[PDB]
C-alpha cells in the first residue's frame, strides 16, 4: 500500500504539511522513551491531576503509559513530544500536587526511595518538551478570571478561572463545578473570552454552580469577593481559521482503538475544527476534532516515524 | 381611632378608589356565605387542583376556608367575590378533577352521599361569581402554547401551555415541570407572551424540563410533535401600568397573619406591583404585591364591609 498510488487512484490530494502545527508534522525526532521508564503526567480523564506513569509500550513516535499501582485498562497513548508529561521531580520544583501510586499516602512518597524499591529508571530530562522553562502565556496568571465555553455543554459560556500555568499553556477551570470539566488552553484559544465578553455580545453568561442569586450575578462584585483579577483584554489573541479543505487526506489516530492510525479524509470543516472520515469505513465512525489536536498528522507521518498505518478498509 | 383623625396627624392621603379594580373596591355586596357551607375551590399552594372546602369563619366580606379531611393549618382566606371558589357539583359539569376529602378514593366520592354523611348544606349557586357561565378569554383554548415568566424564577421566560379555562381566566402550566409552578391569568397579564416573543426580544427561552438537546428547541417542531398550536398573537392585550404613588395610604391583608387587615402605605412602585409598608411596624415586614391582587383595598373598605381594621402600631 502507498499514498502515491492511492492518491492517483482517488484523484485526490493530501493536506499539505504547511497546514499542520510543527509538533503535529515533525518526524525527524527520535523516540528516546524506553520500556519501564518512569515519569509524571496528566490524567487525560482528570486534566488537572498528575500521576506517576510508566512506559508500557512504544510504537514509532508514540508511547503507551501506565498508571503505577492501577489497572492496565486505564493505559493511554501520547506522542513523545507531548507537553502533558514531565520528568521525575518536576511536581516539587513547579508547585504541582502528585498523586502517589495506589497504596501510597502523599506524605509517604519520594522518587529516590520509589526508584530504589522498583529498581526503575526515571526517563531522562532531555526527552521532555515541557519542563516549565519556556516563556509563559503572556497575561494569564493563576487565579485570574475569564469567560470560557464549556466544551461538554458548548452553548454555554461560563465563569472560569486559570488554575495552572505550564510553559505556554494554562488550565481553564469552571468555578464550583467538577474538575473533569477543566481543559488546557493557550492565549489564542477560540473558546475563551475576557470578562465582559458575553454582556458585549448579548449572550447569557452561566455563573458558578449554585451561585446565590445568579440573576443578579455581577463580575465586579464576584471578583471583589474572591480576591481575584480578570485576565486583561490584551492577553487574548485572535487564532486565524485553519486552511484545511474538504476531501484533503491525512492520517489520524482511531478514537475507538487508539493504538491504530488510519488513512483519513476531511469530510467537513468549521473555522477551528475538521470532521474526520476513515476511508473505507462507515460514516458512523466520522468525528469532529480541533485542527491543532496532537492526534492528526500529515500523510507520511506513520512511515517517517515507524508507526504502522492502517490502509483504507477495502473488499 | 379613625382614618380622618390619622390622615390629619400624618398630613397624609389615601390611594383614590379609582386606582383599584372594581372587585377590590366594592363594599355594598353582602356576604351570603355561612358557617359550615360546603363548596369546591382551588388549592392556593397547588393552583391547578380543586378540593372540597368548608366555610370555617366569616369576617365582613371575607371567609376562611378549611380543606375537609386535612389539617386546619392549611386554612386560607378569600373574599366572597373570589373567582377561585365554585358551587358543589361544578367539577363534574365542567371537566375538572376534584380531589376528594382525605382518605377517600376519587370514584367513591359523591356530593349527595357526602352531604348525607356530614348532614351539611352546599353553599347556594347564586353566591359564586365564577360558575363557568361567562364568555371565555378570547383566543385562549385548552392545549394552546405560549411563552410565560416563571414567577418563582422570574428571570426565566419558558415554554408554557394553557391547561384550564374558567370564565375570563386561564391556567398557565410549564411544560414538563411540576404543577406547583402553574398560575392563573387573563389576556392582559404582563407575564405571558406569544410564541416567538423571546426570539424577537433577543431574550433566551427556557425549553421544557430536560428537553432532548435544549439548544435546538424549535417552537414549530415542538408545536407539531405535540399536536398543539400557538395562542394567536392578537389574543394578548396590553395592561396599562397602575397609578399608585409612594406614600398613598390603603388597607392590606397581613401576609403573616391573614385574618388581619392593617393600615398600609405604598413604600415603592413598579409598572404592575406596589410595595406595601405597614404603618408603625418594622420595614422588615414590607412586601411586594401585584397591584390587581384581591388582598389590597381602599381606605374605608374594612369599615364599609364590617371587617376590623388594625390601626398603625403605636407606643
Short mmCIF file of N, CA and C in Angstrom, two decimals, chain B residues 69 75 78 85 113 117 121 127 164 171 182 184 193 208-209 219 241 258 267 275 285 287-288 290 302 307 310:
data_model
loop_
_atom_site.label_atom_id
_atom_site.label_comp_id
_atom_site.label_asym_id
_atom_site.label_seq_id
_atom_site.Cartn_x
_atom_site.Cartn_y
_atom_site.Cartn_z
N UNK B 69 -61.03 16.97 55.75
CA UNK B 69 -60.20 15.77 55.92
C UNK B 69 -58.75 16.11 56.26
N UNK B 75 -55.81 26.18 56.36
CA UNK B 75 -56.94 27.06 56.09
C UNK B 75 -56.47 28.34 55.43
N UNK B 78 -60.31 34.00 51.62
CA UNK B 78 -60.69 34.58 50.32
C UNK B 78 -61.79 35.63 50.56
N UNK B 85 -63.45 29.88 43.84
CA UNK B 85 -64.40 29.01 44.55
C UNK B 85 -65.57 28.82 43.62
N UNK B 113 -74.06 11.76 48.62
CA UNK B 113 -73.74 10.84 49.68
C UNK B 113 -72.92 11.55 50.77
N UNK B 117 -73.84 12.07 54.70
CA UNK B 117 -72.90 11.62 55.78
C UNK B 117 -72.56 12.72 56.82
N UNK B 121 -74.87 21.50 54.33
CA UNK B 121 -75.52 22.16 53.22
C UNK B 121 -74.39 22.63 52.25
N UNK B 127 -74.31 32.56 45.14
CA UNK B 127 -73.20 33.23 45.85
C UNK B 127 -71.90 33.37 45.00
N UNK B 164 -56.28 25.08 31.51
CA UNK B 164 -57.62 25.13 32.16
C UNK B 164 -58.18 26.50 31.80
N UNK B 171 -55.43 28.95 33.11
CA UNK B 171 -54.31 28.48 33.87
C UNK B 171 -53.10 28.23 32.95
N UNK B 182 -47.69 26.39 38.27
CA UNK B 182 -48.82 26.93 37.49
C UNK B 182 -49.39 28.21 38.05
N UNK B 184 -52.76 31.28 37.48
CA UNK B 184 -53.97 31.80 36.81
C UNK B 184 -53.73 33.20 36.30
N UNK B 193 -46.64 35.87 26.96
CA UNK B 193 -46.20 36.44 25.66
C UNK B 193 -46.49 35.37 24.62
N UNK B 208 -38.93 22.99 27.62
CA UNK B 208 -39.43 22.12 28.70
C UNK B 208 -38.30 21.45 29.49
N UNK B 209 -38.55 21.11 30.76
CA UNK B 209 -37.55 20.41 31.57
C UNK B 209 -37.01 19.21 30.84
N UNK B 219 -39.72 26.01 18.28
CA UNK B 219 -41.15 26.08 18.57
C UNK B 219 -42.00 25.37 17.52
N UNK B 241 -49.98 50.39 33.11
CA UNK B 241 -49.41 50.37 34.47
C UNK B 241 -50.39 50.97 35.47
N UNK B 258 -53.08 36.19 58.12
CA UNK B 258 -54.04 36.68 57.13
C UNK B 258 -55.49 36.93 57.58
N UNK B 267 -44.84 51.92 49.80
CA UNK B 267 -43.40 52.20 50.09
C UNK B 267 -42.63 52.45 48.79
N UNK B 275 -45.08 48.11 46.62
CA UNK B 275 -44.53 47.60 47.84
C UNK B 275 -45.29 48.18 49.04
N UNK B 285 -40.98 43.95 57.55
CA UNK B 285 -42.30 43.35 57.12
C UNK B 285 -42.89 43.88 55.79
N UNK B 287 -43.48 44.19 51.84
CA UNK B 287 -43.53 43.13 50.78
C UNK B 287 -44.09 43.72 49.47
N UNK B 288 -43.66 43.13 48.36
CA UNK B 288 -44.26 43.37 47.05
C UNK B 288 -45.53 42.55 46.83
N UNK B 290 -48.74 42.33 43.52
CA UNK B 290 -49.31 42.80 42.25
C UNK B 290 -50.40 43.81 42.56
N UNK B 302 -62.65 48.11 55.09
CA UNK B 302 -62.98 47.33 56.29
C UNK B 302 -64.19 47.91 56.97
N UNK B 307 -65.37 44.55 58.48
CA UNK B 307 -64.17 43.86 58.92
C UNK B 307 -63.40 44.73 59.92
N UNK B 310 -56.75 46.84 61.66
CA UNK B 310 -55.71 47.14 62.65
C UNK B 310 -55.12 48.56 62.43
#
